[PDB]
Amino acid sequence: DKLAATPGMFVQHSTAAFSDRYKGQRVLGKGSFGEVILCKDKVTGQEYAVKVISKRQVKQKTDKELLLKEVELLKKLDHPNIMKLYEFFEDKGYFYLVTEVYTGGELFDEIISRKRFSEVDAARIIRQVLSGITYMHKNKIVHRDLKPENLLLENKRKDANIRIIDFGLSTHFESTKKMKDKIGTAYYIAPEVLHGTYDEKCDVWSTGVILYILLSGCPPFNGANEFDILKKVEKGKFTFDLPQWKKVSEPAKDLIRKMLAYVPTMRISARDALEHEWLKTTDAATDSIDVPSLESTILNIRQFQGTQKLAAAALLYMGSKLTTNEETVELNKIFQRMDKNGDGQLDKQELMEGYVELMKLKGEDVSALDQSAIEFEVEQVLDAVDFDKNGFIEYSEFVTVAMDRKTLLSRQRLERAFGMFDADGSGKISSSELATIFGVSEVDSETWRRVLAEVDRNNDGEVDFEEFRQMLLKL
Ligand SMILES: [Ca+2]
Ligand SMILES: [Ca+2]
Ligand SMILES: [Ca+2]
Ligand SMILES: [Ca+2]
């Protein structure tokens, strides 16, 4: 019964008041359902996006179930290009969703300002989208509502990273049963969804529509109104007949055509679309990538000794929940590069190749490497870093472990971390509090023993804020 530390186990765990952790700054949006508030974490000064929902806004029993469901999706997801959920709170009359703040606004608005995207630009953007959804599709989640309106740029830099959002029409899927609900948006929605039977491939279609727009500034299917769009769509025919397309390379068209294959069975999957030459070829050579960053990350990984569960959870919390995007930009690069097959996980092969790739850049000769020795080392790294024990290194796990410990173990982070564990505010962490954070009924006497003998200096049977400090700060 291996206690799996996952980013998501931290989410619903606090049941404090909004004001116990946050200070509002301004309103980011109001809707009939609720408002999004820009808040400042009182302790860390970091800036978060808090959606605040009145119980009265959503007391449709389906609706409570619907929201709770979007929450469980988000708790599960963890990918550099997909929205990150930090916390879910409850009030006497309110629910709170603490999300990361994405300061770049909608891809839509960036569309209506420059109109057309560079082939380089568009490939990079679309690459990210498909990686998001490859991940989602792998994990049996289909979005059903892709569009520039539901993609945000993280910040304002020229080639900023992209994040997928509003999982309110998203759902779980089992390959054996096809979905039926008619959900989506005029310009982007795939024929089969109109017909009432569809699969996750609709997300590919939508992405294909998105890509058409990026390259030409126009939808491939248009209409006087929604209805006229839908008819155009359902009939299925589109064309590269616009003058704009004269400039654009044939493979890009080829990808577009493979993504807008009318019948889902013949339409390319996300995984496979990722391998399209264009996405492949738009990278003319590896962009200049810091070897030092790469070397240090690989070094910070090797030296993560396997560890007792209290520290593991602590670190995963700090990595997954307390790190600013500015903070992890370079890392998420390396991760993505490491993750050839796009699915947002590192596996033994991908990790092993990473180290080898690094070696040659160090100029080391590849036929001169004790391959069976690397493998072993890699097997052990995975054992050490795989906090949820699924045999894969996920992005949160990666960031936790790849970040400079000194940087990550900032004092604010440390304080706050202890705070989350010590639910009774007693200043002392009980095994019961540990079990609670893990999401489990009780912790094995085994595991508690194996943690105290390494942290409990007073020997009072519990872990206080300084015992905590030393444990982690013990390099
Ligand atoms: Ca992978
Ligand atoms: Ca894992
Ligand atoms: Ca306590
Ligand atoms: Ca103690």
439 Cβ neighbours under 8 A, 6+ residues apart:
9
Q: Reduced to 3 states, what is the DSSP secondary structure of residue 294?
A: helix
CA dihedral 94, 100, 104, 109 (to 10 degrees): -40
Residues that constitute the known binding site for Mg(2+) = 150, 166
Question: Quick one: resolution in A?
Answer: 3.2
CATH of 17-104, one of 3.30.300.30, 3.40.50.1220, 3.10.20.30, 3.30.200.20: 3.30.200.20
The rounded Å distance from CA 88 to ligand 2 centre is: 22
Q: Which of 145, 199, 203, 386 is catalytic?
A: 145
| Gap between the Cα atoms of 154 and 157, Å rounded | 9
The pairing of beta strand 151-153 with beta strand 345-346: unpaired
Closest ligand, as measured to the CA of 454: 4
Q: Which helix (H) or strand (E) holds 52?
A: strand 47-54
| Gap between the Cα atoms of 329 and 106, Å rounded | 20
The rounded Å distance from CA 456 to ligand 4 centre is: 5
Query: How far is Cα of residue 16 from the mean position of the Cα atoms in its chain?
Result: 25
- Please check whether residue 96 is in contact with residue 89, taking contact to mean a CB–CB distance below 8 angstroms: yes
The rounded Å distance from CA 467 to ligand 3 centre is: 14
Domain boundaries, the chain: 1-16+288-475, 17-104, 105-287
CATH fold, domain 105-287, is Transferase(Phosphotransferase); domain 1 (1.10.510)
- Please check whether residue 62 is in contact with residue 76, taking contact to mean a CB–CB distance below 8 angstroms: no
Residues that constitute the known binding site for Ca(2+) = 339, 341, 343, 345, 350, 388, 390, 392, 394, 397, 422, 424, 426, 428, 433, 456, 458, 460, 462, 464, 467
State the helix-helix crossing angle for 411-421 and 309-321, rounded to 10 degrees: 120
Name the token pair of 392: 């894969």
| Gap between the Cα atoms of 434 and 32, Å rounded | 39
Closest ligand, as measured to the CA of 342: 1
**Is the CA virtual torsion 406, 411, 413, 415 positive or negative?**
positive
263 Cβ neighbours under 8 A, 6+ residues apart:
192
Please confirm, yes or no, whether 365 is among the known catalytic residues.
no
Name the token pair of 247: 């400039």
Find where tokens 């997909």 sit: 82
Residue 392 phi, psi dihedral angles, 5° rounding:
-135, 150
Find where tokens 């009030």 sit: 91
The rounded Å distance from CA 77 to ligand 1 centre is: 15
461 to 73, 284, 314, 448: CA distances (angstroms) = 37, 59, 18, 9
| Gap between the Cα atoms of 453 and 465, Å rounded | 16
| Gap between the Cα atoms of 438 and 6, Å rounded | 8
- Please check whether residue 390 is in contact with residue 399, taking contact to mean a CB–CB distance below 8 angstroms: no
Residues that constitute the known binding site = 32, 51, 100, 102, 106, 149-150, 166, 339, 341, 343, 345, 350, 388, 390, 392, 394, 397, 422, 424, 426, 428, 433, 456, 458, 460, 462, 464, 467
Cα angle at 105 between 394 and 64, to 5 degrees?
65
454 to 31, 60, 457, 475: CA distances (angstroms) = 50, 50, 8, 14
In terms of C-beta density within 10 A (0-12 exposed, 13-18 middle, 19 or more buried), how is residue 19 classed?
A: exposed
Name the token pair of 461: 């049977």
Elucidated via: X-ray
In terms of C-beta density within 10 A (0-12 exposed, 13-18 middle, 19 or more buried), how is residue 294 classed?
A: buried
Query: How far is Cα of residue 425 from the mean position of the Cα atoms in its chain?
Result: 31
Residues that constitute the known binding site for ATP = 51
Q: Reduced to 3 states, what is the DSSP secondary structure of residue 267?
A: coil
Strand partners, 26: 38
370 Cβ neighbours under 8 A, 6+ residues apart:
none
The pairing of beta strand 47-54 with beta strand 94-100: antiparallel
415 Cβ neighbours under 8 A, 6+ residues apart:
43, 465
> Same CATH fold, 105-287 and 17-104?
no
Residue 52 phi, psi dihedral angles, 5° rounding:
-120, 120
361 to 108, 294, 331, 355: CA distances (angstroms) = 39, 10, 18, 10
Name the token pair of 2: 């291996």
Find where tokens 């520039």 sit: 148
285 to 280, 288, 351: CA distances (angstroms) = 10, 9, 21
* Among 402, 355, 392, CA closest to 135: 392
The rounded Å distance from CA 450 to ligand 4 centre is: 14
Cα angle at 139 between 136 and 144, to 5 degrees?
40
Find where tokens 């209506």 sit: 112
129 Cβ neighbours under 8 A, 6+ residues apart:
81, 146, 151, 162, 164, 207, 210
Report the 10 Å Cβ neighbour count for 371: 12
The pairing of beta strand 171-172 with beta strand 141-142: antiparallel
Q: Which helix (H) or strand (E) holds 25?
A: strand 22-30
Name the token pair of 234: 């359902």
| Gap between the Cα atoms of 431 and 210, Å rounded | 50
Total residues found in the chain within this entry: 475
The rounded Å distance from CA 335 to ligand 2 centre is: 14
| Gap between the Cα atoms of 301 and 72, Å rounded | 30
| Gap between the Cα atoms of 306 and 387, Å rounded | 10
| Gap between the Cα atoms of 215 and 218, Å rounded | 8
Q: What is the DSSP letter of 23?
A: E
| Gap between the Cα atoms of 438 and 405, Å rounded | 23
- Please check whether residue 11 is in contact with residue 100, taking contact to mean a CB–CB distance below 8 angstroms: no
Cα angle at 353 between 371 and 355, to 5 degrees?
80
| Gap between the Cα atoms of 49 and 40, Å rounded | 9
| Gap between the Cα atoms of 298 and 385, Å rounded | 12
Query: How far is Cα of residue 309 from the mean position of the Cα atoms in its chain?
Result: 24
| Gap between the Cα atoms of 125 and 121, Å rounded | 6
Query: How far is Cα of residue 186 from the mean position of the Cα atoms in its chain?
Result: 27
Closest ligand, as measured to the CA of 393: 2
Q: Which helix (H) or strand (E) holds 34?
A: strand 34-41
In terms of C-beta density within 10 A (0-12 exposed, 13-18 middle, 19 or more buried), how is residue 377 classed?
A: middle
7 to 64, 154, 206, 270, 381: CA distances (angstroms) = 23, 20, 29, 25, 19
The rounded Å distance from CA 106 to ligand 4 centre is: 49
Closest ligand, as measured to the CA of 431: 3
| Gap between the Cα atoms of 380 and 386, Å rounded | 10
Direct distance between the N- and C-terminal alpha carbons of the chain, in angstroms, rounded to an integer? 29
The rounded Å distance from CA 430 to ligand 4 centre is: 10
Query: Which residues sit with Cβ closer than 5 angstroms to ligand 1, an ion?
Result: 339, 341, 343, 345
Closest ligand, as measured to the CA of 385: 2
| Gap between the Cα atoms of 327 and 272, Å rounded | 31
The rounded Å distance from CA 83 to ligand 4 centre is: 38
Three-state DSSP string of 121-187: HHHHHHHHHHHHHHHHHHCCEECCCCCHHHEEECCCCCCCCEEECCHHHCEECCCCCCECCCCCCCC
Find where tokens 């391998």 sit: 275
